[PDB]
Amino acid sequence: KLPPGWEKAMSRSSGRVYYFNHITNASQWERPSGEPARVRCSHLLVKHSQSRRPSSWRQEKITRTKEEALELINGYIQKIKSGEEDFESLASQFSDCSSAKARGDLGAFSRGQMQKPFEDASFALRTGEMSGPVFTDSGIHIILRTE
Numbered sequence: 059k060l061p062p063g064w065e066k067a068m069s070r071s072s073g074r075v076y077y078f079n080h081i082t083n084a085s086q087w088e089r090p091s092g093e094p095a096r097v098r099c100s101h102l103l104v105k106h107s108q109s110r111r112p113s114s115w116r117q118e119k120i121t122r123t124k125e126e127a128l129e130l131i132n133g134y135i136q137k138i139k140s141g142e143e144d145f146e147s148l149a150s151q152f153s154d155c156s157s158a159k160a161r162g163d164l165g166a167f168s169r170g171q172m173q174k175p176f177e178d179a180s181f182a183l184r185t186g187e188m189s190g191p192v193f194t195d196s197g198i199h200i201i202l203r204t205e
């Protein structure tokens with residue numbers, strides 16, 4: 059039927075079909091379009107109190123709850139999708155990952171190097187596509203596949 063991970067759903071408020079990907083947590087109104095050894099991605103990480111290391115270059119002690127970190131993630135996605143903000147400006151300013159200094163870019167990588175939920179989402183993304191919230195032991199990620 060549809061590309062890997064994609065399912066049809068109904069909007070509760072509007073009643074129109076949309077498409078949701080349970081690997082990437084992407085969701086959109088349009089029917090998705092159309093595996094390589096390596097992909098290249100950037101990401102924006104928001105850490106929380108149950109992160110494996112609740113510390114970042116932005117905050118020595120990160121205290122926010124998981125739920126608060128998800129709200130931050132959901133807000134950044136909205137601003138990226140509306141075009142008020144570029145993914146890069148938000149990653150550089152707000153990612154709790156040291157890759158913030160490189161606009162979130164992690165370089166190229168293959169399966170077997172990243173934490174599994176991040177890896178699965180990265181390889182299910184198409185070039186140019188962006189994930190929804192992706193949960194790992196580091197925190198919550200927005201992922202942008204660049205190559």
Ligand SMILES: Nc1ccc2c(c1)COC2
Nearest residue numbers: 103155172173176194196
């Ligand atoms: N900080 C950070 C960078 C890359 C990854 C994770 C955390 C979790 O798995 C992939």
